[PDB]
Every structure is written in C-alpha cells, then in structure tokens.
Design a protein around this ligand. Structure first.
Ligand SMILES: [Mg+2]
Ligand SMILES: [Mg+2]
Ligand SMILES: [Mg+2]
Ligand SMILES: [Mg+2]
Ligand SMILES: [Mg+2]
Ligand SMILES: [Mg+2]
Ligand SMILES: [Mg+2]
Ligand SMILES: [Mg+2]
Ligand SMILES: [Mg+2]
Ligand SMILES: [Mg+2]
Ligand SMILES: [Mg+2]
Ligand SMILES: [Mg+2]
Ligand SMILES: [Mg+2]
Ligand SMILES: [Mg+2]
Ligand SMILES: [Mg+2]
Ligand SMILES: [Mg+2]
Ligand SMILES: [Mg+2]
Ligand SMILES: [Mg+2]
Ligand SMILES: [Mg+2]
Ligand SMILES: [Mg+2]
Ligand SMILES: [Mg+2]
Ligand SMILES: [Mg+2]
Ligand SMILES: [Mg+2]
Ligand SMILES: [Mg+2]
Ligand SMILES: [Mg+2]
Ligand SMILES: [Mg+2]
Ligand SMILES: [Mg+2]
Ligand SMILES: [Mg+2]
Ligand SMILES: [Mg+2]
Ligand SMILES: [Mg+2]
Ligand SMILES: [Mg+2]
Ligand SMILES: [Mg+2]
Ligand SMILES: [Mg+2]
Ligand SMILES: [Mg+2]
Ligand SMILES: [Mg+2]
Ligand SMILES: [Mg+2]
Ligand SMILES: [Mg+2]
Ligand SMILES: [Mg+2]
Ligand SMILES: [Mg+2]
Ligand SMILES: [Mg+2]
Ligand SMILES: [Mg+2]
Ligand SMILES: [Mg+2]
Ligand SMILES: [Mg+2]
Ligand SMILES: [Mg+2]
Ligand SMILES: [Mg+2]
Ligand SMILES: [Mg+2]
Ligand SMILES: [Mg+2]
Ligand SMILES: [Mg+2]
Ligand SMILES: [Mg+2]
Ligand SMILES: [Mg+2]
Ligand SMILES: [Mg+2]
Ligand SMILES: [Mg+2]
Ligand SMILES: [Mg+2]
Ligand SMILES: [Mg+2]
Ligand SMILES: [Mg+2]
Ligand SMILES: [Mg+2]
Ligand SMILES: [Mg+2]
Ligand SMILES: [Mg+2]
Ligand SMILES: [Mg+2]
Ligand SMILES: [Mg+2]
Ligand SMILES: [Mg+2]
Ligand SMILES: [Mg+2]
Ligand SMILES: [Mg+2]
Ligand SMILES: [Mg+2]
Ligand SMILES: [Mg+2]
Ligand SMILES: [Mg+2]
Ligand SMILES: [Mg+2]
Ligand SMILES: [Mg+2]
Ligand SMILES: [Mg+2]
Ligand SMILES: [Mg+2]
Lengths: 183, 109, 386, 63
RNA sequence: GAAAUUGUUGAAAGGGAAGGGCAUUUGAUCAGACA
RNA sequence: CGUGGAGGUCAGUGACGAAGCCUAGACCGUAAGGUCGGGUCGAACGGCCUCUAGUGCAGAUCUUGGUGGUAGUAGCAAAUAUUCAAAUGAGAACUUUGAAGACUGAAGUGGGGAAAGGUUCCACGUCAACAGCAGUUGGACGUGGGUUAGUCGAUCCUAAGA
RNA sequence: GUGAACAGCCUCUAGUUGAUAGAAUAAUGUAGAUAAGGGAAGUCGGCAAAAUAGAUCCGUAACUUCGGGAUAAGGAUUGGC
C-alpha cells in the first residue's frame, strides 16, 4: 500500500485503490472531491443519482468553458457535470472498500469516506493527423484512484498540557493580596 | 401499489411531430410514443411491439400518420429484477380509423 | 480620419443597457403631480394586454383633409377586471430621498395574493400573513397606531392593490401586487380612503374616462440573443465579405485602445421596460355588458371578443380599456396603465372620439364575419346545422 | 451466437444472394452448429433456411 | 529515486498580477547561556 | 571557494550504516561555500600537503530528455437514414438473427482481374493495445487450416531497345 | 420504364444500410431557397444571382474568304382522351 497522507484509525478503517485506470484524470478528480468526507452510504446514493442526471458533480478546478446547470445550486457552483465513466470507476472502488470493511468486521453503518485521492497515471500516447502532413500527440490522461473508509466515532474528550504559569515578584504579590483583600 | 391495466389510447403524433426534421419524424414518433406511454402508466420501462414499429414506419421516415390508436398494457417485470417491477407494452390496434375514439379500458381476461 | 460621409448614429443611448429587465412587471418610475384639491382616487391600474382590433370613426380635426371623414384606426384591448385594495404604504421625505416607514395590511387576503408571496404554493403550509391577521383581534390597537403614524408623518401615500387574475382567461393563478400613489386631497383623507377600501374593490371607470390620454408601462416582448444588424439597425455588410456580414466592420479606432460603450454589439433584444405616453382611451368597456363591441351607430349586440376569441389569449368577460393604437408588451403580459403627467392641450388630445364600428371579425385567419349570426345569414344552411 | 458464416454459406448452397437467405431465429442453436455445406444443405430442405421470394417489378403498368 | 509538474492533508494570505528591500507587531518554531 | 582524477599522509569515516537525496531545524563564513541534527537509503567515502584537467551555466530561435498553462478547450458537422424486438453476453445506440424503413440504380456501393500488397483468405479462440464514441465485432490479437493444370499463364518468338 | 439517349430521375438482380451518439434550434456562419414597388441607382467591374433552354412550325440583319454569320434576332404551339 502506502497511500497518501491519512490521519484515520487503521484499526477502524478499510481501503482500496485502482492504478493505471483509463479514465479522465480531471473529470474523476472532480468527482472524487465531490464525495470526499461523505457518509459512505450517502455517497453511493449520490453517484447513483448523478448517473440519472438527477443531481450533478460540481466542477471546481478543472472546469473552464464547462456548461452551467441548475443542478449545482446544491453546491453553490454554476458549472457542474455528470461524468459517467468517472462515477462508475469510483463506485467500483467504493464497492470494493465496502467489502473489505465487511471482511474486517467494521460497522457498515458508521462508514464514511475519509481519504479519496486521485492523481495521474502514466499517459498513453496515440497520434493524429494535422494539415500539411503533420502529426500531433493524442493522449489518454489516465488515473490512479485510492480511497479509505472509516467507522465514524463521536466525542474526543479533553486532556492536554497544563500551562506552566510564570509571573514575577510584583506579579505574584498582586495575587496574594487579590485574596488577602478579597475572594 | 402496482396496478396491471390495459387501455386503448389514441395519440396525436401530428402536433408532436410538427416542426420535426423529415429524416427524424418516424424516429421521433417512436420516442414520442415511449414518452406518451410513461406519462400514462407512470412506467420508465416501455416496450414497443415490432408491429407497432411497422405501423409507425408504414410510410417511410417522414410520412407518419397524424393519429395512431395504440394499446398500452402495463405488466409486471420478470427475471434479474430491474429497478421497477412494472413495464409497459404498446401495440397497434386494428382499427379502420384512429379518428374519433375516446380513451377506454380493456377488461382483463 | 473622419467618416468621409456623415450619418446619424444607430440607436438611442438613453435605453442602454439593452439587458433583460429585472421583472415582467415594468415599474412606475413617476406618478402625476398631486393636486390635493380633488377627490381621492387611484393614479394607475393593472391589466392584461388581450390583443388588437380595428375601429372606424369620424375624425373631427378642423383643418385636415379628413375633417368629418371616417378613418380606420388600430387599437389594443387590455382586460381590466377590478383591482383589489389590500394595503396602504406611507412614505416620508429624507435628505437621502423617499423612504417607506410603514405598510398597513388588510385583515383578510385573497389566495391570489397569498399566491404571490410564494414559489411552492402546493407544498407550503400557507402561513403568510397569519400572525399579522391576528393584529386585528384586540380592539384594533396595533393597526390604528400604524395608520395613525402614517397620518402624522408621510409625504405620500400609496395603495397596495392586486389583480383578480382568476377573472381572466389566463392559466397563471398567481396574481399581481403593486403600489399605486393616491392623489386625492390631504394625507389624512388618503389613508382614510385606503383604510376604508381594505378587502373592498376598485373599478377602472373610477380612474379612467373616455378620450383620456394615458401612458402604458410594460416589459417589451422578448427575442433573446440578437445580432448587431437587427438589434441596432446597422447596415447589412456586402455579400462578398469573408466570415459573414450581419456585423459592424469597424468596432472602433485604434485609439482609445478599447471597444467603446457607444458601438453596436450583438446581445439581448427585447424584454426591456418601457414607458409609452399619450395613448388615448377610445372606450372604457364594461364586463357586465353585452353590446361591448356595439356602437351608437352599429346597434347589433356583440362583445369585443372576436369570433373564435382573441388569438392566443381568450375571451374578455370583464371591463376593458380600449386604447388607440399599440402598446409596449405582448398578449398575456401584465400592463400598468398610468395617468398622464401633464395636461396636454394638443387638439389631438382633447378631441372627443366616439367610435362608429368595432371590428370583431376573427383574427385567426382572414376574418369574413362579424358574428355567427352574420355568418349563418350569408352562408345558408350546412350539412351540420338543423 | 453469430450466424454470419451460415448466412453466406446458405446463399452459396441455394445459389442466391445473401439478401435472400432466411435463417429462423427460433432454431438459432441448431443453425450455429451447421459448419459445413452438407449441414446447411439439410437445414435448407427441412425449412430452417428458406429461400425468400423475389421482389416484384411488374411490367403491368408498362404494358 | 532530485527537479519541473501533480493529487491529498495541514497552516496561511488574497478589493485590477505576484514576487523584493529596511523595520517592527502578531503566530509558529528554535539555539545558547544560567547555574 | 567548489568538481573528476594523481603522489603523500591522517595506522582518517563506514553494514552498529559509506555515498546520494529530502528538511520555511541548528551553527561558522562578507561571500564562493562549510558544518551538524532528523528522515530516506544501502557500499563505499573524506580532511590536510602537493599533482593534474574534458573543472563550476540562466540565457546561445543552444543539445537530448522530461514537464506545464493553454484545456476537459478547438474539435470529433462532406458522402440523404435510420427503427422495433429477440438472442448472446459481466456489459449491447454499435455483435448475431428476425421484422421494417431506405440506398447504390448496372457509367453499381454488383460480378472479376492488371500493377502493388503478401496471408489480409478460412476456422476456432479472443479484447490488454489498435479501429480519434463504443465493442461481446474486425483487415486487430492467439492458434491453426488453405493455393492440385500435357490443354490457364509463364516458359518459346520477335518490337523499340539492351 | 420515361427519354434522342450508356443523361437525369424511379425500379429488378446483387451489395449495402459503414460515416460517435443524445437534447435543444440563440447570435454569427456554411450550404439550399423566397421576397412588395423600383430595376444596376450597388460595384473597379453586373462579382454573385436571376433570366433563357427541349421539340414542331413560322420567321431571320450587317457583313463574308460564299463555306458562313444562324438555334441570328423575333414569333406560335405542346397535357388527357
Ligand atoms: Mg500506484
Ligand atoms: Mg484548469
Ligand atoms: Mg488549473
Ligand atoms: Mg461552455
Ligand atoms: Mg465553447
Ligand atoms: Mg472564459
Ligand atoms: Mg462557479
Ligand atoms: Mg485531421
Ligand atoms: Mg500527406
Ligand atoms: Mg490591591
Ligand atoms: Mg419550422
Ligand atoms: Mg464630418
Ligand atoms: Mg436578475
Ligand atoms: Mg416601524
Ligand atoms: Mg435573425
Ligand atoms: Mg433599421
Ligand atoms: Mg423596427
Ligand atoms: Mg454596419
Ligand atoms: Mg472573399
Ligand atoms: Mg525504485
Ligand atoms: Mg523581517
Ligand atoms: Mg582548491
Ligand atoms: Mg579534487
Ligand atoms: Mg575528467
Ligand atoms: Mg524547499
Ligand atoms: Mg550546532
Ligand atoms: Mg540518520
Ligand atoms: Mg547516510
Ligand atoms: Mg548491494
Ligand atoms: Mg594543489
Ligand atoms: Mg567543459
Ligand atoms: Mg550564470
Ligand atoms: Mg539549464
Ligand atoms: Mg532559459
Ligand atoms: Mg549569462
Ligand atoms: Mg533550455
Ligand atoms: Mg474527457
Ligand atoms: Mg467542445
Ligand atoms: Mg468542421
Ligand atoms: Mg449533433
Ligand atoms: Mg453523412
Ligand atoms: Mg449506428
Ligand atoms: Mg433509388
Ligand atoms: Mg447513369
Ligand atoms: Mg463503400
Ligand atoms: Mg477476386
Ligand atoms: Mg496487401
Ligand atoms: Mg476474415
Ligand atoms: Mg478492452
Ligand atoms: Mg487497424
Ligand atoms: Mg476507439
Ligand atoms: Mg475501449
Ligand atoms: Mg491471425
Ligand atoms: Mg496463420
Ligand atoms: Mg496455352
Ligand atoms: Mg518450358
Ligand atoms: Mg462490396
Ligand atoms: Mg467523420
Ligand atoms: Mg423584388
Ligand atoms: Mg424592366
Ligand atoms: Mg454606377
Ligand atoms: Mg439602364
Ligand atoms: Mg456609387
Ligand atoms: Mg475596370
Ligand atoms: Mg469607376
Ligand atoms: Mg456570372
Ligand atoms: Mg421569377
Ligand atoms: Mg464582324
Ligand atoms: Mg449576331
Ligand atoms: Mg390537344
């Protein structure tokens, strides 16, 4: 393994990845961020809808000259899309992560997606023909996807330092009399 | 619930195809009907009898009749379980004239 | 260098920006100057553009080659059921400009207005104005003090009226709310009038009368995204020109090295707010009246609704304003008709028309018949019929 | 399934263009087994492959 | 297994570029020296 | 001041971790640079005196390689046209079959050859790449099979010419 | 088949139905059309576009190397039974 930076409890987490996937790296970036942090079950129901064109994926970085859509008011964005091939690869991983948590014995109900990172796989050169007998690259830009699921947990309690208070002769003198005087 | 009914409707293709590019009229007709079917049966699954297909294309791409008298039949889905338990079947009814019929219910047996 | 030949520009810069209006209900930016000697009444009205027809009437213009001759003239018709009074709003003068300080509302409120305060009426619990209505309960205390406050301060009073859209062929269901200034005498008498008319109803014939010059305020029909040639009336470019010709050739000199605000560019066309003045009222129609379309000289009983009905609108069953000529806005659109802001002496205004005949022939084709009566008369008996 | 070869073969055996061999959908399993001309042959004669009639170009209106 | 260049996490700043100099507030971080 | 290599020397450092790389951690130098900690790593390496040079880069429309913004953007719009159902299959707008609607209209989108290609032919299997969507399909991929002559061509003859 | 016709247009036999796809139909385009009254005033210039057209019959100037110019120009007619 050796995923990217996580902070989660591996004892309470499960994980999955797919490398060298041939999907748009930009598109699936946007859909991975769309789900990052989510309740795992809300995420599944959500990508599902996306495929119905019922809600959309908000495009937030890779997005200039994308179209506008009311389906992104949900998220405060005007540009949003419905990148099918991304969703379907990404739910593939999510379903795999699910399994592994079943297998580990984690509670399927506390499962949120706690790490979801895509970056860029090696490219795929293919070429095309331009005017006056020229060639040009015509490339696939594929993706590694990796995600982690965790059982949610409440609270955190307290516990920290103690603040080592230091205060001079005339600074501890005032306090002495702040009670020798009063309460 | 579900409901399993058959009715026999008449659909005005003419105002639905009004405007549509000649090479697209018969194909809109197909799609249009499908939509007409869902609007009455609530059902996203809509199958067209290959005879209803013939009926539609009876006069080339751009020569769809102005009114068709179809028979929409809402049935339950079987096998591999699709999203919804119900679907529709559409059939051409053998009428002399699709002009002037009201929408009726076929009694079930 | 210099134009070579001189020609005026293309289009008026007092109508920029040529963008879509903030609303379908164009705004009254101006009410008539108040003469507080006269009785209290409205100074505008709400209606819907129904459509147009033809009129015939003797012209009375001494001096004109058509003095005492008939003319045929075009007219619009706006469907004009009574507006209904539901609130008064009192404005005060500040060195920052006019500001509203209270709005007093009527106790009951028609659903048609309650409609307006919503975007999803059906789902909603329809709580609009339900606590407010309770202000009446107790004796009156709350609403008196407000009414009272208006009376004490307030440099102008406007009335909140709304339309009776259900009395109208439209499908729209959701009525139209609007403020109308009150120019009858005395701030106090004004609010008294306003209060007296809560939930009660006001008629057109108490704001407009025959031959009156009135203004029309409305949102111009829409055309969406437009080329430079039709949007600005720019010259068509020659047929030989590469990459197209409904354009402007020079979008500007090299300096200012900026395209300037004053040149024609493609973009939205129509859906602009307009304020047309000087439309003379040729008829104030009453809804509870047959013979609407009849005249002194016609006689033959008939309403102004054309055979088969106003194309794209419906029927007209309520009172109407028949205005000479045409009007910003299109059929089915809310229109505000405003009182004039000056007393025109003109001659052209002042002339007291009286129609001779009102076209009532169908507008869905080349109409041939005024009435079914006329059509049976001329046609004879048919394979349907008796 | 894939009755591509059996179609062509059907055309050849009957001596008629592929635009006129008819392979009935209901006996698709049986047909796909037919790998030879000898097997297409008895498929033809027991009605599984039939020869589909000519399209008429009548001289009547000419005459 | 560097760099350009990228994903994620954390921290921060951003009214028509950004980066830089002298100086100090504030946050973070740290050496030395006491004895 | 710094680099690769050479003579001398410190009986120098090191698998109990050499070298290298990373680090808005520490320290020395006005500076070139030097030193250390921590992480990473895995087999060699350094101080001083001297010797030696293919010895120090930001530029040269520099060389080779790698990478960006542009941008999920230009675009994927010529050649009239597609449709219903079944079957198959993890998956079917695109495969197979049936139905229907059309086209080429014999100056063919038919049936064959010459040059040129060289196995593309045919069967079976089959989808990682490839067919600028797809793919269960293919002129792709894997594995095989297939080209029968006294009479058809060559071979003989002569032409311009060699 | 129509026609002078190996033209164009429709068909039989055979062969295809290959050409990313879906939804809309803004501006500006590319390609295809029409436009009242006027009729080249447009423009370097009638560029583009429009007009004419097959056949049968009638009719046909200057000039000429006597061969032409000539479908000169200008007219009428044309289905079905
Ligand atoms: Mg990897
Ligand atoms: Mg970007
Ligand atoms: Mg970017
Ligand atoms: Mg866009
Ligand atoms: Mg664009
Ligand atoms: Mg932009
Ligand atoms: Mg946005
Ligand atoms: Mg190209
Ligand atoms: Mg070339
Ligand atoms: Mg004290
Ligand atoms: Mg149209
Ligand atoms: Mg001048
Ligand atoms: Mg707005
Ligand atoms: Mg107040
Ligand atoms: Mg236009
Ligand atoms: Mg103009
Ligand atoms: Mg105009
Ligand atoms: Mg111009
Ligand atoms: Mg040009
Ligand atoms: Mg490695
Ligand atoms: Mg500083
Ligand atoms: Mg040195
Ligand atoms: Mg050295
Ligand atoms: Mg060297
Ligand atoms: Mg750094
Ligand atoms: Mg130190
Ligand atoms: Mg270490
Ligand atoms: Mg080391
Ligand atoms: Mg080793
Ligand atoms: Mg030396
Ligand atoms: Mg050198
Ligand atoms: Mg330098
Ligand atoms: Mg360099
Ligand atoms: Mg450089
Ligand atoms: Mg330099
Ligand atoms: Mg360089
Ligand atoms: Mg993409
Ligand atoms: Mg695009
Ligand atoms: Mg193109
Ligand atoms: Mg398209
Ligand atoms: Mg094409
Ligand atoms: Mg297709
Ligand atoms: Mg044809
Ligand atoms: Mg031909
Ligand atoms: Mg071809
Ligand atoms: Mg051959
Ligand atoms: Mg070859
Ligand atoms: Mg093959
Ligand atoms: Mg594949
Ligand atoms: Mg290939
Ligand atoms: Mg491809
Ligand atoms: Mg593929
Ligand atoms: Mg092979
Ligand atoms: Mg082989
Ligand atoms: Mg021989
Ligand atoms: Mg021999
Ligand atoms: Mg072929
Ligand atoms: Mg193409
Ligand atoms: Mg004209
Ligand atoms: Mg003329
Ligand atoms: Mg001229
Ligand atoms: Mg002239
Ligand atoms: Mg001129
Ligand atoms: Mg010239
Ligand atoms: Mg000139
Ligand atoms: Mg020309
Ligand atoms: Mg003409
Ligand atoms: Mg001459
Ligand atoms: Mg001549
Ligand atoms: Mg005759």
């Amino acid at each position: 393994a050796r995923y990217g930076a996580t902070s989660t409890n591996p004892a309470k987490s499960a994980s999955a990845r797919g490398s060298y996937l041939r999907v748009s790296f930009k598109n699936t970036r946007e859909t991975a961020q769309a789900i990052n942090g989510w309740e795992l079950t809300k995420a599944q129901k959500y990508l599902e809808q996306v495929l119905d064109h019922q809600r959309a994926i908000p495009f937030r970085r890779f997005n200039s000259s994308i179209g506008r859509t009311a389906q992104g008011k949900e998220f405060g964005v005007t540009k949003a899309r419905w990148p099918a091939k991304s969703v379907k690869f990404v739910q593939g991983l999510l379903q795999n992560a699910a399994a592994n948590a079943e297998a580990k014995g984690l509670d399927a109900t506390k499962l949120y997606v706690s790490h979801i990172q895509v970056n860029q796989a090696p490219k795929q050169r293919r070429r095309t023909y331009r005017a006056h007998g020229r060639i040009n690259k015509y490339e696939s830009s594929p993706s590694h996807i990796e995600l982690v699921v965790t059982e949610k947990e409440e609270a955190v309690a307290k516990a920290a330092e103690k603040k080592v208070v230091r205060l001079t002769s005339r600074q501890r003198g005032r306090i002495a009399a702040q009670k020798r005087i009063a309460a | 619930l579900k409901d399993v009914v058959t009715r026999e409707y008449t659909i005005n293709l003419h105002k639905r195809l009004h405007g549509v590019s000649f090479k697209k009229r018969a194909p809109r007709a197909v799609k249009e009907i499908k939509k007409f079917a869902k609007l009455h049966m609530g059902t996203d699954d809509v199958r067209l009898a290959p005879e209803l297909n013939q009926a539609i294309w009876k006069r080339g791409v751009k020569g769809v009749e102005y009114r068709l008298r179809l028979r929409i039949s809402r049935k339950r889905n079987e096998e591999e379980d699709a999203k919804n338990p119900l679907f529709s079947y559409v059939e051409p009814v053998l009428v002399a004239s699709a002009k002037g019929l009201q929408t009726v219910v076929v009694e079930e047996d | 260098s210099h134009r070579k030949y001189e020609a005026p520009r293309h289009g008026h810069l007092g109508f920029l920006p040529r963008k879509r209006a903030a609303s379908i209900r164009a705004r009254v930016k101006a009410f008539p100057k108040d003469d507080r000697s006269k009785p209290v009444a409205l100074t505008s009205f709400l209606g819907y553009k129904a459509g147009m027809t033809t009129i015939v009437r003797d012209l009375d213009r001494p001096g004109s080659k058509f003095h005492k001759r008939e003319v045929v003239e075009a007219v619009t018709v706006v469907d004009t059921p009574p507006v209904v009074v539901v609130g008064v709003v009192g404005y005060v003068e500040t060195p920052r400009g006019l500001r509203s300080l209270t709005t007093v509302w009527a106790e009951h409120l028609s659903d048609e207005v309650k409609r307006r305060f919503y975007k999803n009426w059906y789902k909603s619990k329809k709580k609009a104005f339900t606590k407010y209505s309770a202000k009446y309960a107790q004796d009156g205390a709350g609403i008196e003090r407000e009414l009272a406050r208006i009376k004490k301060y307030a440099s102008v009073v406007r009335v909140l009226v709304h339309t009776q859209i259900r009395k109208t062929p439209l499908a729209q269901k959701k009525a139209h709310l609007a403020e109308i200034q009150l120019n009858g005498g005395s701030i106090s008498e004004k609010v008294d009038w306003a209060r007296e008319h809560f939930e009660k109803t006001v008629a057109v014939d108490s704001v407009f009368e025959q031959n009156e010059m009135i203004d029309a305020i409305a949102v111009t029909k829409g055309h969406g995204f437009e080329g430079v040639t039709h949007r600005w009336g720019t010259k068509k470019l020659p047929r030989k020109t590469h990459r197209g010709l409904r354009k402007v050739a020079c979008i500007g000199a090299w300096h200012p090295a900026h395209v300037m605000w004053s040149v024609a560019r493609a973009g939205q066309r129509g859906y602009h707010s307009r304020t047309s003045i000087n439309h003379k009222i040729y008829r104030v129609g009453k809804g509870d009246d047959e013979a609407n379309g009849a005249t002194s000289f016609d006689r033959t009983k008939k309403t102004i609704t054309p055979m088969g009905g106003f194309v794209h609108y419906g029927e007209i069953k309520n009172d109407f304003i028949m205005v000479k000529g045409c009007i910003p806005g299109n059929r089915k659109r809310i229109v505000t008709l405003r009182k004039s802001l000056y007393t025109n002496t003109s001659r052209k205004a002042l002339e007291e028309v009286s129609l001779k005949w009102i076209d009532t022939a169908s507008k869905f084709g080349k109409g041939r018949f005024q009435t079914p009566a006329e059509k049976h008369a001329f046609m004879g008996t048919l394979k349907k019929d008796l | 399934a894939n009755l591509r070869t059996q179609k062509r073969l059907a055309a050849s055996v009957v001596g008629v263009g592929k635009r006129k061999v008819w392979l009935d959908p209901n006996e698709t399993s049986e047909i796909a087994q037919a790998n030879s001309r000898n097997a297409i042959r008895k498929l033809v004669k027991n009605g599984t492959i039939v020869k589909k009639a000519v399209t008429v170009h009548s001289k009547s209106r000419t005459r």
